[PDB]
Design an enzyme around this catalytic site. Structure first.
Site, short mmCIF file in Angstrom:
data_model
loop_
_atom_site.label_atom_id
_atom_site.label_comp_id
_atom_site.label_asym_id
_atom_site.label_seq_id
_atom_site.Cartn_x
_atom_site.Cartn_y
_atom_site.Cartn_z
N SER A 1 -44.52 24.63 22.56
CA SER A 1 -45.35 24.60 21.32
C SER A 1 -45.55 24.13 20.46
O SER A 1 -44.58 24.48 19.98
CB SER A 1 -46.09 26.58 21.29
N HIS B 1 -55.98 35.13 21.97
CA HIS B 1 -55.69 35.02 22.91
C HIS B 1 -54.30 36.16 23.13
O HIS B 1 -53.87 36.17 21.87
CB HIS B 1 -54.77 32.82 23.18
N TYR C 1 -39.75 28.52 24.53
CA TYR C 1 -40.02 30.06 24.59
C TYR C 1 -39.43 29.86 26.07
O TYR C 1 -40.21 29.50 27.04
CB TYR C 1 -41.41 30.16 24.50
N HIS D 1 -53.67 37.39 18.96
CA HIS D 1 -53.82 36.51 17.84
C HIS D 1 -54.62 35.24 18.30
O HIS D 1 -54.67 34.63 19.02
CB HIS D 1 -52.26 36.10 17.30
N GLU E 1 -53.94 31.56 16.05
CA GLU E 1 -53.12 30.70 15.23
C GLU E 1 -52.89 31.18 13.77
O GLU E 1 -53.97 31.16 13.44
CB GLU E 1 -53.19 29.07 15.81
N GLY F 1 -42.97 25.08 8.47
CA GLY F 1 -43.09 23.90 10.13
C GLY F 1 -44.07 24.60 10.80
O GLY F 1 -42.81 25.39 11.87
ZN LIG Z 1 -51.01 31.69 19.90
#
Ligand SMILES: [Zn+2]
Ligand SMILES: O=c1[nH]cnc2c(-n3cc(CCN4CCC(c5ccc(-c6cccnc6)cc5)CC4)cn3)nccc12
Ligand SMILES: [Cl-]
Ligand SMILES: [Zn+2]
Length: 340
Positions: free
Chosen positions: A276, A264, A165, A176, A178, A158
């Site tokens: 996001s 980022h 957020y 981190h 993605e 998913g």
């Molecule tokens: Zn991120």
């Protein structure tokens, strides 16, 4: 490459016509060298709005608010999450705007950035993170985070679903990239700004080496410990160890794009809401195949489907373990060819 050699964060102002095709626009910003910074800002046309009003989301439930406890000193920190019971946007907004948790008084961003690195270990804030959902209206066809229609849809976990957020002052996201080193899109629906830091993909291995040196226990336990999203490193610490980075502030109504292997981090200035999701382009496929994943514990995608469809010639070689392709981080996505 002669396109964005400085690898600085680029901002784009597409017209309504340019904005309509999401994938075509991502290919365009890559042709311009946007991907070299690892992060890009896209300001949408003034006429475009994803929702008419946000006055009807008070009873929206945040199922797992997290109290963010930060430990550390001298620019190096570990963030621990304490899951709290479910709360509404109404309750969250009341806490976010309260005297205890509200944004401090400030003149320039540099002042607020200093207050953040000086106080991030005190008075732990609550982050209304990872809410499954969208704030986009059904009819919105342009840059709809809920349905971007990229090559990543070949998957359906998913990682293709959108997340909400709800931030407050001092809530943060640790260093981190993605999951599966994918791209990401972040839209700030409303509220106070969100500040970002990025390390260009071509310098990411230098951040990892720094991070491994500082947290050697974590590195021994898991090769990809930065994927736990608990490591906070201040810009001063980056500067001290020669890690090139850039910073940008995202304001309400703006999009941020993160590129494959773009590290980022950042923080929220105050009460706000962001949406996001992850997405992909043909360029991502090699990153997906080469991604170092969390071994302790996580989001894993089987690359087979992507190699069969987009690299049929390399399928046998890759499954045999003979595909020794070296990623050039400066190269744009093949879809960018029409702009080059
Ligand atoms: Zn991120
Ligand atoms: O403002 C932000 N707040 C939380 N998280 C963020 C993030 N990411 C979260 C994930 C985990 C998703 N499951 C990945 N990136 N990136 C960028 C920005 C944010
Ligand atoms: Cl609101
Ligand atoms: Zn791990």
């Amino acid at each position: 490459e002669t396109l964005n050699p400085s690898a600085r964060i680029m901002t784009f102002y597409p017209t309504m016509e340019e904005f309509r095709n999401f994938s075509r626009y991502i290919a365009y910003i890559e042709s311009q060298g946007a991907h070299r910074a690892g992060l890009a800002k896209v300001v949408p046309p003034k006429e475009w709005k994803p929702r008419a009003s946000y006055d009807d989301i008070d009873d929206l439930v945040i199922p797992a608010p997290i109290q963010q406890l930060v430990t550390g000193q001298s620019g190096l920190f570990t963030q621990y999450n304490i899951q709290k019971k479910a709360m509404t946007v109404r309750e969250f907004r009341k806490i976010a705007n309260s005297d205890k948790y509200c944004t401090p008084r400030y003149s320039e961003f540099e002042e607020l950035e200093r207050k953040y690195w000086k106080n991030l270990t005190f008075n732990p804030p609550i982050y209304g993170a990872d809410v499954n959902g969208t704030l986009y209206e059904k009819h919105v066809d342009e840059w709809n985070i809920g349905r971007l229609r990229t090559i990543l849809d070949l998957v359906e976990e998913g990682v293709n679903t959108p997340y909400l957020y709800f931030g407050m002052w001092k809530t943060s996201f640790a260093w981190h990239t993605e999951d599966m080193d994918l791209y990401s899109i972040n839209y700030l629906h409303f509220g106070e700004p969100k500040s970002w830091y990025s390390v260009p993909p071509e310098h990411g291995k230098r951040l990892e080496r720094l991070a491994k040196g500082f947290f050697p226990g974590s590195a021994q336990s898991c090769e990809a410990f930065l994927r736990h999203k608990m490591t906070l490193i201040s810009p001063l610490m980056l500067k001290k160890y020669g890690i090139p980075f850039d910073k940008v502030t995202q304001e309400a109504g703006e999009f941020m794009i993160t590129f494959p292997y773009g590290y980022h981090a950042g923080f929220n200035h105050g009460f706000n809401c962001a949406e996001s999701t992850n997405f992909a382009t043909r360029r991502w496929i090699e990153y997906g195949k080469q991604a170092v994943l969390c071994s302790c514990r996580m989001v894993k995608i089987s690359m087979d489907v992507f190699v069969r469809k987009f690299q049929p010639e390399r399928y046998k070689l890759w499954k045999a373990g003979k595909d020794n392709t070296v990623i050039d981080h400066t190269l744009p996505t093949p879809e960018a060819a029409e702009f080059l």
